[PDB]
């Protein structure tokens, strides 16, 4: 069992690295999702300010 047990830890290290790569990818996408979910309040506030200025 010298060369047989190395493949189980070798696949588990690749899956554990792929899970950390997927978590880092979701953590990298969370900032763009936060900014894309954050520009809508600036747009809705700019439209309300433009409506409040155009009304006066």
């Amino acid at each position: 069992s010298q060369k047989n047990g190395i493949a189980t830890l070798l696949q588990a290290e690749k899956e554990a690295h792929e899970i950390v790569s997927k978590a880092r990818k979701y953590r990298q996408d969370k900032l763009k999702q936060a900014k894309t979910d954050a520009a809508k309040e600036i747009d809705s506030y700019k439209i309300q300010k433009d409506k409040e200025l155009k009304e006066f």
């Binding site: 010298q2 047990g5 190395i6 830890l9 070798l10 290290e13 690749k14 554990a16 690295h17 792929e18």
Partner: protein
């Protein structure tokens, strides 16, 4: 041997090493087991003299 699938990558923690014999590798396994617990692999391979050793650990414990 133990092309290349997990010997040139970075997703698998592999540790190679040359030794004189298995008697000198037994003291390295006793020192690694006394200073690091049961978090390693103890293997020995006969070479042409030299001894083929291979260790297995995590990918983030390569510095230790």
């Amino acid at each position: 041997e133990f092309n290349i699938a997990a010997a040139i990558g970075a997703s698998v923690n592999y540790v190679t090493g040359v030794i004189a014999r298995d008697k000198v590798a037994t003291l390295e396994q006793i020192l690694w087991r006394v200073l690091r617990g049961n978090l390693f692999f103890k293997t020995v391979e006969i070479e042409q003299k030299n001894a083929f050793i291979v260790f297995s650990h995590g990918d983030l414990i390569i510095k230790r």
